[PDB]
Scaffold this active site. Sequence first.
Site, PDB file in Angstrom:
ATOM      1  N   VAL B  45       0.824  -1.194   0.000  1.00 13.99           N
ATOM      2  CA  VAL B  45       0.000   0.000   0.000  1.00 13.99           C
ATOM      3  C   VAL B  45       0.871   1.261   0.000  1.00 13.99           C
ATOM      4  O   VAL B  45       0.435   2.299  -0.450  1.00 13.99           O
ATOM      5  CB  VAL B  45      -0.939  -0.010   1.225  1.00 13.99           C
ATOM      6  CG1 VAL B  45      -0.190   0.083   2.549  1.00 13.99           C
ATOM      7  CG2 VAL B  45      -1.991   1.084   1.137  1.00 13.99           C
ATOM      8  N   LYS B  46       2.086   1.206   0.537  1.00 15.69           N
ATOM      9  CA  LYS B  46       2.903   2.418   0.594  1.00 15.69           C
ATOM     10  C   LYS B  46       3.264   3.006  -0.772  1.00 15.69           C
ATOM     11  O   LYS B  46       3.630   4.175  -0.845  1.00 15.69           O
ATOM     12  CB  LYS B  46       4.194   2.255   1.366  1.00 15.69           C
ATOM     13  CG  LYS B  46       3.981   1.761   2.786  1.00 15.69           C
ATOM     14  CD  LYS B  46       3.235   2.757   3.672  1.00 15.69           C
ATOM     15  CE  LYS B  46       2.608   2.028   4.869  1.00 15.69           C
ATOM     16  NZ  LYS B  46       3.608   1.497   5.757  1.00 15.69           N
ATOM     17  N   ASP B  47       3.181   2.202  -1.841  1.00 20.02           N
ATOM     18  CA  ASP B  47       3.367   2.679  -3.202  1.00 20.02           C
ATOM     19  C   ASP B  47       2.517   3.921  -3.473  1.00 20.02           C
ATOM     20  O   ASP B  47       2.966   4.826  -4.196  1.00 20.02           O
ATOM     21  CB  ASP B  47       3.011   1.633  -4.268  1.00 20.02           C
ATOM     22  CG  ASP B  47       4.042   0.524  -4.463  1.00 20.02           C
ATOM     23  OD1 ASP B  47       5.035   0.486  -3.686  1.00 20.02           O
ATOM     24  OD2 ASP B  47       3.861  -0.300  -5.394  1.00 20.02           O
ATOM     25  N   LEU B  49       1.547   6.125  -1.198  1.00 17.57           N
ATOM     26  CA  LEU B  49       2.135   7.216  -0.390  1.00 17.57           C
ATOM     27  C   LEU B  49       3.335   7.803  -1.141  1.00 17.57           C
ATOM     28  O   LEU B  49       3.475   9.017  -1.256  1.00 17.57           O
ATOM     29  CB  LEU B  49       2.542   6.666   0.982  1.00 17.57           C
ATOM     30  CG  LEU B  49       3.264   7.649   1.906  1.00 17.57           C
ATOM     31  CD1 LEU B  49       2.398   8.862   2.173  1.00 17.57           C
ATOM     32  CD2 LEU B  49       3.640   6.972   3.219  1.00 17.57           C
TER      33      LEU B  49
END
Lengths: 306, 306
Positions: B45-47, B49
């Site tokens: 999920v940090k992709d 961000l």
Amino acid sequence: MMIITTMQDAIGRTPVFKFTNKDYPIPLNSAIYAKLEHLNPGGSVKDRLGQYLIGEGFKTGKITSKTTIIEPTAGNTGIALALVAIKHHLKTIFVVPEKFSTEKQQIMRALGALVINTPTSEGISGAIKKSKELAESIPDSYLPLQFENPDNPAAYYHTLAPEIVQELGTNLTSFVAGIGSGGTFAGTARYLKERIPAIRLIGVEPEGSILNGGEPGPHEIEGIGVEFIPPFFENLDIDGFETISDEEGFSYTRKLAKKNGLLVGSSSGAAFVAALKEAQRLPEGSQVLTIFPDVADRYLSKGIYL
Amino acid sequence: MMIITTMQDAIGRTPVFKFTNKDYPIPLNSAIYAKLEHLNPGGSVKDRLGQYLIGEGFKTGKITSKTTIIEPTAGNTGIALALVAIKHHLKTIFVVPEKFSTEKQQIMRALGALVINTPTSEGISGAIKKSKELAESIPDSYLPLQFENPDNPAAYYHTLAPEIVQELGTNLTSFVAGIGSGGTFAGTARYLKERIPAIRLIGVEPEGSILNGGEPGPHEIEGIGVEFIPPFFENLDIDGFETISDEEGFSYTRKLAKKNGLLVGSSSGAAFVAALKEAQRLPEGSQVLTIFPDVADRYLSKGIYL
Ligand code: MET
């Protein structure tokens, strides 16, 4: 995207990465297209094979609710079969030569498979023999034998190859792909040759594979390399095989990550190097297709990215 | 799918897995929807961000062509920033406690980042301190400090949350998500609350996190857990926090693989069990949304599936 109730619903429809002379030393107006099969939910191209083998098995009556699937594998075919087996609650046994990716074996077991190891020095041939022994001793067993089953190339002929032509059309000069079993290369090549008769076909192997007549031997590149000539190549006009050294294959694996953000296995780097050599020998404006089979993450316990 | 020239083009538009009473003890006509953020090209999920921070940085002037990005991270944010940096040829420096996450550090370096280690016993706070020193001493640096930057939740507010409502609509009863920094939960919750005022909000933490008043202490679940209140929750109406034991979180991580073919991290298993508890306490017909943050593959050396 989509709401799914099975991870099978997420197999295929993968993107294609386009490389030009702005990325790598390639002739003017030439391009390399890499089909990103590592983005499958099982992390490899073999997801398509797994889906096809089990699907057709149910149609032919080779697989029923009673069936235990037994297959020799380097890892990815095991993952794909275990993943697809879940929907029908099929039991799976994979025979894996010992020092092939421990990550892949962990994932196979995580998906509910039994993993039995054979010695690394008997290679895939030793795994095949052992898988045959188990099948005779297990009732209602089914042994796909990817290494000889014509349904192997047919899986790619029916799934992966049509996707390529849907995205890229018939404007391809060459198809370059790594060979393990030979199914991906042969199935895809057959489909392309039917629509693009003039396309060139290059198969890719690491040093210590035998396709160009060399002596058999160990190689760090994982997933490609043969110990016997695949039986799937008889009707095929193959233009050549490209033998890639471990040094070169790993070098381009690292470049794909550093330059392009692609986290792919050594067999992708090998295929990519072979595609660069093919682009470099063709006229300006040539379009070269390759396949990146699997994700890098299953090789972190080894050198990959060192 | 598509033809891409940057792996950034493949961030987002992830599928949603739907679980019903067929899969797990979920009431009749209820469902759990898991947004599968592990299928982003950086594996988390940090992709989203990373993509947002860099995009907006160029917009506000906080980032230009020879800015160096510096961030303390325990892994995924580093991967995301390194992946997104490639397109604009930005240099990155990540400060990571030695022994935090080797695989993730290998991937950061593979993508072109400089990784600087701090002692394991100084934890994440040691990494933060060191990152602050570098920023002062490097001209034209940019130091997001995700753990206090309001652009952290804003990223999800602008990217993830609208995508969810496009796919699932407004018939959502509850949103259940793991909290590390709190950005994913807070950003997504803010957007959902605007569109679905009745939605319940449940934050998920492992045992040894403090949100339910328990004593601080270590936990094997990776990616979630706080030792203090995140600064992002000031204007959120949170219904509850769910504390998940390592035993329960790892158990459901294994079940997601074995039963569903989902190869997700322990923070996904934790989120999922929390979502199951929430579905079980709501009326029949309730729809519970959760997020599966990252891939299992980066935790195989830690026995994620034992
Ligand atoms: C053709 S071997 C089957 C599995 C796959 N080749 C792997 O590398 O794991």
